[PDB]
């Protein structure tokens, strides 16, 4: 509701976007790891 308040909310929103990106990257990391595990397990089960 004020000018400087707006220019501060801008930075706060930018920081929020940064944080959410940082968290989504961790979700993606775990997901890729799990996919690789699943492929290797699917092959090892057939061989066993």
């Amino acid at each position: 509701t004020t000018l400087k308040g707006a220019m501060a909310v801008m930075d706060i929103a930018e920081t929020a976007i940064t944080n959410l990106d940082q968290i989504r990257a961790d979700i993606a990391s775990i997901q890729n790891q799990v996919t690789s595990t699943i492929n290797n397990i699917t092959v090892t089960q057939v061989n066993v």
Binding site: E14, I17, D21, A25
Partner: protein
């Protein structure tokens, strides 16, 4: 992450364009309004 940063920056610049257009509107209003004051002052000097 890079795509989200670039999307944020593109949207911010898109809104900044509208802010600039509003600034132009205000300044043009004031400028074109000063003209009648100029002519009135000229007339005052002529009458004096």
């Amino acid at each position: 992450a890079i795509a989200d940063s670039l999307r944020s920056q593109a949207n911010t610049l898109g809104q900044a364009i509208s802010n600039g257009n509003d600034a132009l509107g205000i300044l043009q209003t004031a400028d074109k309004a000063m003209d009648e004051q100029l002519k009135i002052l000229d007339t005052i000097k002529t009458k004096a």
